[PDB]
Structures are given as structure tokens and as C-alpha cells.
């Protein structure tokens, strides 16, 4: 119902290690931190759905940056 401050630095090691140098990763666990917690412990646990919501976050902050 929102991620611990133990669990949000968890999301965001998992971002930094799916995302290049430079990417908005305190803005993209931003994101990944406020999804509901069965989406959160599955971000953690499979790297590939970890890459997919990392991506169309990053996607979502282009998209905004306009």
C-alpha cells in the first residue's frame, strides 16, 4: 500500500542495474514504488517485468518532458 523506505531502495539497486548511466532511475523507482504491492514484489523477482514497466516509465517521463 505503498513500499517501505527498506523496499524502495530495493526497487531502486533493480532499476539501476536494467537501466545505462544517465537514465532517471530515482524518478523511475518513483513510479515502480506507487504500483500496488503484488506488481512491486514481482519487479523485484522477475528481471524481465522489472525491464518492461523500467521502460514504459521511461517512456512516460519522454513523453512528459516536452
Do not use: C, H, W, Y
Request: glycine share 4%; aromatic share 4%.
Amino acid at each position: 500500500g505503498g513500499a517501505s523506505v527498506k523496499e524502495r531502495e530495493r526497487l531502486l539497486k533493480a532499476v539501476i542495474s536494467v537501466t545505462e548511466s544517465g537514465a532517471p532511475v530515482e524518478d523511475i523507482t518513483d513510479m515502480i514504488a506507487s504500483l500496488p504491492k503484488k506488481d512491486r514484489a514481482l519487479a523485484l523477482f522477475n528481471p524481465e517485468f522489472l525491464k518492461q514497466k523500467v521502460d514504459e516509465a521511461k517512456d512516460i517521463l519522454d513523453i512528459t518532458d516536452e
